[PDB]
Design an enzyme around this catalytic site. Structure first.
Site, PDB file in Angstrom:
ATOM      1  CG  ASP A   2      14.023   6.721   3.315  1.00 31.04           C
ATOM      2  OD1 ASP A   2      14.037   7.502   2.486  1.00 31.04           O
ATOM      3  OD2 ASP A   2      14.279   5.559   2.907  1.00 31.04           O
TER       4      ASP A   2
ATOM      5  CG  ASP B 277      12.694   1.348   4.613  1.00 32.47           C
ATOM      6  OD1 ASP B 277      13.369   0.337   5.060  1.00 32.47           O
ATOM      7  OD2 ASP B 277      13.178   2.327   4.005  1.00 32.47           O
TER       8      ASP B 277
ATOM      9  NE  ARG C  22      13.098   6.133  -1.498  1.00 34.35           N
ATOM     10  CZ  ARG C  22      12.705   7.465  -1.614  1.00 34.35           C
ATOM     11  NH1 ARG C  22      12.410   8.039  -2.532  1.00 34.35           N
ATOM     12  NH2 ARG C  22      13.462   8.476  -0.693  1.00 34.35           N
ATOM     13  CG  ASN C  23      10.780   3.939   1.814  1.00 36.28           C
ATOM     14  OD1 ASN C  23      11.185   2.650   1.662  1.00 36.28           O
ATOM     15  ND2 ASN C  23      11.365   4.903   2.031  1.00 36.28           N
TER      16      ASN C  23
HETATM   17  C1  LIG Z   1       8.948  -9.062   4.772  1.00 34.00           C
HETATM   18  C2  LIG Z   1       9.177  -7.786   5.334  1.00 34.00           C
HETATM   19  C3  LIG Z   1      10.245  -7.652   6.250  1.00 34.00           C
HETATM   20  C4  LIG Z   1      10.484  -6.514   7.014  1.00 34.00           C
HETATM   21  C5  LIG Z   1       9.800  -5.343   6.322  1.00 34.00           C
HETATM   22  C6  LIG Z   1       8.625  -5.410   5.422  1.00 34.00           C
HETATM   23 CL1  LIG Z   1       8.174  -3.986   5.079  1.00 34.00          CL
HETATM   24  C7  LIG Z   1       8.441  -6.607   5.084  1.00 34.00           C
HETATM   25  N1  LIG Z   1       7.358  -6.818   3.958  1.00 34.00           N
HETATM   26  C8  LIG Z   1       7.664  -6.512   2.661  1.00 34.00           C
HETATM   27  O1  LIG Z   1       8.633  -6.104   2.125  1.00 34.00           O
HETATM   28  C9  LIG Z   1       6.661  -6.565   1.966  1.00 34.00           C
HETATM   29  C10 LIG Z   1       5.260  -6.635   2.313  1.00 34.00           C
HETATM   30  N2  LIG Z   1       4.661  -6.590   1.026  1.00 34.00           N
HETATM   31  C11 LIG Z   1       5.296  -6.641  -0.116  1.00 34.00           C
HETATM   32  N3  LIG Z   1       4.477  -6.639  -1.057  1.00 34.00           N
HETATM   33  C12 LIG Z   1       5.228  -6.454  -2.539  1.00 34.00           C
HETATM   34  C13 LIG Z   1       6.550  -5.636  -2.762  1.00 34.00           C
HETATM   35  C14 LIG Z   1       6.968  -5.509  -3.828  1.00 34.00           C
HETATM   36  C15 LIG Z   1       6.331  -5.763  -5.039  1.00 34.00           C
HETATM   37  C16 LIG Z   1       5.083  -6.557  -4.955  1.00 34.00           C
HETATM   38  C17 LIG Z   1       4.313  -7.073  -6.107  1.00 34.00           C
HETATM   39  O2  LIG Z   1       3.717  -8.456  -5.942  1.00 34.00           O
HETATM   40  N4  LIG Z   1       4.315  -6.481  -6.903  1.00 34.00           N
HETATM   41  C18 LIG Z   1       4.028  -6.390  -8.556  1.00 34.00           C
HETATM   42  C19 LIG Z   1       2.526  -6.486  -8.126  1.00 34.00           C
HETATM   43  C20 LIG Z   1       1.763  -6.426  -9.593  1.00 34.00           C
HETATM   44  N5  LIG Z   1       2.940  -6.747 -10.679  1.00 34.00           N
HETATM   45  C21 LIG Z   1       3.501  -8.004 -10.354  1.00 34.00           C
HETATM   46  C22 LIG Z   1       4.414  -7.894  -9.017  1.00 34.00           C
HETATM   47  C23 LIG Z   1       4.653  -6.748  -3.666  1.00 34.00           C
HETATM   48  S1  LIG Z   1       7.030  -6.338   0.288  1.00 34.00           S
END
Ligand SMILES: Cc1cccc(Cl)c1NC(=O)c1cnc(Nc2cccc(C(=O)NC3CCNCC3)c2)s1
Length: 273
Positions: free
Chosen positions: A133, A151, A137-138
């Protein structure tokens, strides 16, 4: 094996992601001052398969140690709700990031993002992990502009997927290379939707008939050549991720090589007297 974190060290501060079984939060972690983290929950009532998939993702991420792969801080499994805690990527998903920052970066910056993604994918493929995938987006972006593949797990996004994966479900690192070619196009276009308004069946039909995405605007010739070779119908002719990393590293180290642009075919003509 995975670091077990006590719930009292975790403060969830804000929802940042879509949550059926749970949500993804921005938060802080006690470990020294607190460090920002991302926190993914699994809410009560989860099934066995959801538990295996959830903790499976953390298991996979704990097996990896690479600059361009999301780093796992630890898990909460002894208490409920269960949690996966990773580094916090401050700029979010790459596709949304590019669309909201249209035209704000140099070509060299964009190609460095691609080198980072490619390095992560080379590591994954060498580790015998097929992503399936791969798409902007990932990919997650931090405040150093570092792009990290995210992801993970196992259990189809047509316009990112190689023909053999669509046609008969053959997912390999070579089908990930096809997807990486689409990601190259996403990056160089600042998040354009691949094939634009074509339907999924129209995309498959076009690919099978030999058509490929056209050159982005302001795209180095070397970069368009590389993404075109990622899209060869015959899997065995596609570059390996080692080839991709090597080529991108050489282009970045000799950055004048990026100044030669591929021709852009304009959809519109403006003529002025
Ligand atoms: C926690 C976790 C568990 C399993 C797999 C994963 Cl890959 C993760 N970690 C994550 O999903 C993430 C790690 N860092 C992430 N950062 C993130 C994701 C989506 C949006 C933002 C974020 O702050 N986005 C905008 C930044 C600028 N405008 C305000 C918000 C940050 S998501």
């Amino acid at each position: 094996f995975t670091t077990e974190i006590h719930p009292s060290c975790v403060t969830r501060q804000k929802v940042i992601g879509a949550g059926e079984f749970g949500e993804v939060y921005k938060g802080m972690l006690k470990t020294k001052k607190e460090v920002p983290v991302a926190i993914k929950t699994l809410k009560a009532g989860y099934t066995e398969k959801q538990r295996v998939d959830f903790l499976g993702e953390a298991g996979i991420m704990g097996q990896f140690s690479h600059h361009n792969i999301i780093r796992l801080e630890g898990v909460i499994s002894k208490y409920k709700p269960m949690m996966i805690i990773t580094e916090y990527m401050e700029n979010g998903a790459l596709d949304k990031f590019l669309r909201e920052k249209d035209g704000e970066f140099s070509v060299l910056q964009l190609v460095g993002m691609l080198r980072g993604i490619a390095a992560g994918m080379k590591y994954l493929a060498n580790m015998n992990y097929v992503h399936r995938d791969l798409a902007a987006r990932n990919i997650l972006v931090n405040s150093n502009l570092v792009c990290k593949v995210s992801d993970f797990g196992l259990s189809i996004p047509i316009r990112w997927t190689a023909p053999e994966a669509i046609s008969y479900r053959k997912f390999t690192s070579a089908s990930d290379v096809w997807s990486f070619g689409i990601v190259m196009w996403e990056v160089m276009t600042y998040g354009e939707r691949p094939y634009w308004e074509l339907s999924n069946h129209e995309v498959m039909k076009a690919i099978n008939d030999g058509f490929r995405l056209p050159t982005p605007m302001d795209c180095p010739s070397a970069i368009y050549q590389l993404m075109m070779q990622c899209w060869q119908q015959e899997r065995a002719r596609r570059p390996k991720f080692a080839d991709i990393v090597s080529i991108l590293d050489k282009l970045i180290r000799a950055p004048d090589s990026l100044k030669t642009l591929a021709d852009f075919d304009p959809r519109v003509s403006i003529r002025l007297p």
